[PDB]
Amino acid sequence: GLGEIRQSMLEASNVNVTEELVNMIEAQRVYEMNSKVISSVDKMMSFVNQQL
């Protein structure tokens, strides 16, 4: 069941240059969405000690 040796041949990387770009798009958006929550909590805590 082992593989066969092919001379004068090379195996290219199996990375999908389109998978990474689509993965970048989602990861960038999730990164920004969580930042707004941190900013939102900061203003809410800032409101409490500024009002009370």
């Binding site: 969405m33 929550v37 409101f47 009370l52």
Partner: protein
């Protein structure tokens, strides 16, 4: 001083708790097989003597969004996703059966079929699925069937070894446990293996968090939280004014 300070503080505190619940959904947008948690408020009245004017509100998790998640095509033999409604029976480290949707399966050195989180996947025997060690081609069937090819065997020696245990119980009768595994609310209730659930192999199911829905509820929680904080400030302002009765 007026008891509306704590009646408004409790509302403000609970709005923060709902904010924590929503913030967890946004942190888990890219999680595999993640069911978004719901958040609401319940009006609990202080029944007793006096005028019925004091009603509290506490946040609760009435349920989860069991809609189909985002399916990611990975072109991997050990990647499966449930078609529509269903679950995969797994046991955690303790050894307790739980329903998950993480179809990112893997095989260890001993041959046990686990998922990305390390939970053993159950089979028809109700025991964790164990494959022969020297494999050469693993294909998951449409109905959860696992067919393997022994190493060095010809292409015609394809046989099934096990079947993935797929369970389709009532969604509203499930609760998410402390480790993300959905279980029955009634303890000691068997998980019956359903023969209707289908697996779309070659793909992975993402989370079903509606990001815009989370954000538009965040902006509502902020406004309701801040209004109650102003009630706290107007409660102490009234107390300071009434303090001049005894002054003389």
């Amino acid at each position: 001083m007026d008891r509306a300070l704590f009646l408004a503080m409790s509302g403000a505190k609970q709005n923060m708790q709902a904010l924590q619940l929503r913030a967890n959904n946004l942190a888990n947008v890219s999680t595999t097989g993640f069911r978004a948690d719901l958040a609401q408020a319940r009006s609990m009245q202080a029944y007793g003597e006096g005028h019925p004017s004091r009603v509290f509100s506490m946040t609760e998790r009435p349920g989860h969004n069991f809609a189909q998640g985002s399916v990611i095509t990975t072109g991997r033999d050990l990647d499966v996703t449930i078609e529509g409604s269903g679950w995969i029976s797994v046991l955690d480290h303790t050894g307790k059966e739980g329903l998950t949707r993480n179809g990112n399966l893997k095989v260890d050195q001993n041959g046990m079929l686990t998922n990305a989180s390390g939970h053993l996947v159950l089979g028809e025997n109700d025991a964790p699925i164990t494959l022969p060690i020297p494999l050469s081609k693993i294909e998951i069937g449409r109905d959860g069937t696992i067919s393997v090819l022994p190493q060095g065997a010809p292409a015609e020696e394809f046989q099934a070894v096990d079947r993935i245990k797929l369970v389709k119980p009532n969604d509203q009768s499930l609760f998410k446990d402390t480790n993300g595994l959905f279980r029955h609310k009634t303890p000691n209730q068997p998980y019956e293996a359903d023969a209707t659930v289908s697996l779309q192999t070659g793909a992975i199911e993402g989370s079903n968090v509606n990001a815009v829905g989370e954000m538009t509820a965040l902006i509502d929680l902020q406004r309701q939280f801040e209004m109650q904080v102003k009630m706290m400030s107007t409660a102490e302002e009234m107390d300071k004014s009434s303090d001049s009765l005894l002054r003389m």
